[PDB]
């Protein structure tokens, strides 16, 4: 339950291109920058919730 | 898409090449001049040509382009002949001679040239 | 010269600002917004109106649209008092007569037309903006020349060919004794109507939309693209989207104010 704001979008990835990989920062701690993936439609400036804040990602997944 | 057919590109280039004197920046003035300075059948082709000409006037008002000619700076000649200083850029004294060139001037050349230097 | 205020009630270019001779606060702005305004709105045309004027009595408004026609309007009711149709090419400018009974119009058809306000007799003789002499008529041409006509028989009086660029409009003295031009050359030519010879020049720099003569100060205000320039008749300028150009200048009857027609509707008053 660590709400994160989408900071940049790294293009659609995946087999069908359904998942979209983005970089986010926490609203509780702005200075921490993580990479995650999101289904559905995502634009910059949005706020996204999660459950586990420790999972990492890769560039151009 | 919005890219321009070679016909409209060409005709815009020609109308600017031969009619840069009066044609202005507004699109509607460009089209009302095009309709009588040239015969274009399709009205929307004429609109495309007028808009393209306006875009190239925006391009050219900052500097010259690679497309048009005549009055070959943009509108007036005599750009570089005026770059003639009252004294030549080439000096004649203490003119850039080194050890091996000194040995050369000891060879067939004259070692007492006016521009000889000990550098 | 200082700022009075700003206007933002227009969505396109206002091309002509006309004020009644009687100095009454019923000025008419004719715009290429397909709409007019009264400081009442007019929309009877279907194209972009260019030139507007106000009758001598000050209770009517004459405006011509780029569709190629002209209309004289009942200002109070906002309805056309009369139409004027027969300019196949788009009209460019309008003006009244010395008695404000005949209407002179210049269009894109390389010709000028005189119309009766009520009569059915019409006569004809790219002609730019025209302004009748308060009785010859001056006009701009398509070859950097300014023509002066004769009202006695609709004949050409003389031609003035000293302009390096095209002539976008003409200026006449309030007493009908001067002529002035301007254009892309940036040098405004001033001549005398009587002899029709070149008097002198003033330096501005670029296109001047409207050249307005001061009725009282005997001055000349020009809407140069670089900076609006005002001369006194010492020939010396004794006025300031990435593109910024005016469209018209209008001298007030009082003489202490002036009104500008701009591009994005920012009508500005100076005093």
């Amino acid at each position: 339950v660590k709400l994160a704001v989408v900071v940049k979008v790294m293009g659609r990835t995946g087999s069908r291109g359904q998942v979209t990989q983005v970089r986010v920062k926490f609203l509780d701690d702005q200075n921490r920058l993580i990479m995650r993936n999101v289904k559905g439609p995502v634009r910059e400036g949005d706020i996204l919730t999660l459950l586990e804040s420790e999972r990492e990602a890769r560039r151009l997944r | 898409g919005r890219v321009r057919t070679k016909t409209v590109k060409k005709t815009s280039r020609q109308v600017i090449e031969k009619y840069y004197s009066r044609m202005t920046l507004d699109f509607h003035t460009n089209k009302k001049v095009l309709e009588e300075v040239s015969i274009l059948q399709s009205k929307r082709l004429r609109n495309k040509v007028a808009g393209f000409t306006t875009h190239l006037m925006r391009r050219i008002q900052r500097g010259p382009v690679r497309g048009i000619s005549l009055k070959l700076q943009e509108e007036e000649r005599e750009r570089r002949m005026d770059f003639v200083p009252e004294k030549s850029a080439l000096e004649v004294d203490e003119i850039r001679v080194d050890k091996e060139t000194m040995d050369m001037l000891a060879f067939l050349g004259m070692a007492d040239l006016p521009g000889v230097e000990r550098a | 010269l200082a700022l009075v205020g700003t206007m933002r009630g227009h969505n396109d270019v206002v091309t002509a600002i006309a004020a009644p001779i009687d100095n009454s606060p019923y000025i008419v702005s004719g715009s290429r917004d397909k709409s007019l305004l009264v400081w009442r709105r007019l929309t009877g045309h279907g194209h972009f109106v260019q030139d507007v004027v106000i009758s001598s009595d000050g209770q009517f408004a004459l405006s011509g649209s780029w569709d190629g026609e002209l209309r004289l309007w009942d200002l109070s009711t906002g309805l056309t008092t009369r139409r004027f149709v027969g300019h196949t090419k788009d009209v460019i400018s309008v003006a009244f007569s010395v008695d404000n009974r005949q209407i002179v119009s210049a269009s894109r058809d390389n010709t000028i037309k005189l119309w009766n306000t009520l009569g059915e007799c019409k006569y004809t003789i790219w002609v730019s903006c025209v302004r009748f002499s308060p009785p010859t008529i001056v006009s701009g041409s398509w070859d950097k020349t300014v023509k002066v006509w004769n009202l006695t028989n609709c004949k050409l009086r003389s031609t003035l060919a000293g302009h390096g660029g095209y002539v976008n409009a003409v200026a006449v003295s309030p007493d009908g004794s001067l002529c002035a031009s301007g254009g892309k050359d940036g040098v405004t030519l001033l001549w005398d109507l009587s002899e029709g010879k070149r008097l002198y020049q003033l330096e501005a720099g670029s296109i001047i939309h409207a050249l307005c003569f001061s009725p009282n100060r005997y001055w000349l205000c020009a809407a140069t693209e670089e900076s609006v320039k005002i001369w006194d008749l010492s020939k010396h300028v004794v006025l300031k989207n990435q593109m910024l150009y005016c469209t018209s200048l209008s001298w007030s009857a009082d003489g202490s104010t002036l009104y500008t027609g701009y591009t994005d509707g920012t009508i500005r008053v100076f005093k």
């Binding site: 709400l3 995946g14 999101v38 995502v42 919730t49 459950l51 | - | -």
Partner: protein, 178 residues
């Protein structure tokens, strides 16, 4: 204010208890709140355009199923009015609040695709919640004494123990195992 839902519901009482699903729901009482969820506006033109659409419009448009029900938005908004009256009269609160609570408690957070688990878009979250609620109401309404409004009302209050919450539970269970 001067704008109320069916001249009956006041929008200036409903908030969202989250800072991640605010802009996607048109519940703010400054704009985007309408008289009824029926409007002939275009929302599929550009991306993220349906976020500006009112939430009630989304709820009433997601009920025109199955193929024997589409093109009948009139029944949809009538049924939403009936279920709205049921909810307000029972719970003694603003039915907009119950709708928002049900939507905000019926959105799944994570899925698993490609099999790796990863999060869900908030617009997809609200869309999935609305689709789940409508399908659950349809399931509870088929071959039963209940009418549409009654099952819709029950699923709306139960989601503020319910079909939609159990569907989200199993989806999240499948997600969290990978």
């Amino acid at each position: 204010g001067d704008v109320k839902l069916f001249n009956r519901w006041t929008f200036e009482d409903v908030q969202v208890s989250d800072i991640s699903l605010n802009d996607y729901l048109a519940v703010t009482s400054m704009k985007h709140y309408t008289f009824l969820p029926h409007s002939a506006g275009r929302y599929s033109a550009k991306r993220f355009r349906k976020a500006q659409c009112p939430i009630i419009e989304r709820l009433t448009n997601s009920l025109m199923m199955h193929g024997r029900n589409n093109g009948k938005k009139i029944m949809a908004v009538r049924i939403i009015k009936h279920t709205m009256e049921i909810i307000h009269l029972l719970t003694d609160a603003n039915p907009i609040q119950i709708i928002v609570d049900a939507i905000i408690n019926s959105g799944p957070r994570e899925d698993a695709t490609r099999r790796q688990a990863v999060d869900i878009s908030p617009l997809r979250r609200v869309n999935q919640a609305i689709y789940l609620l409508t399908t659950g109401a349809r399931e509870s309404a088929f071959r039963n004494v209940k009418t549409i409004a009654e099952c819709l009302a029950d699923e709306l209050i139960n989601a503020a123990n319910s079909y939609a919450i159990k569907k989200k539970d199993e989806i999240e269970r499948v997600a969290k195992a990978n």
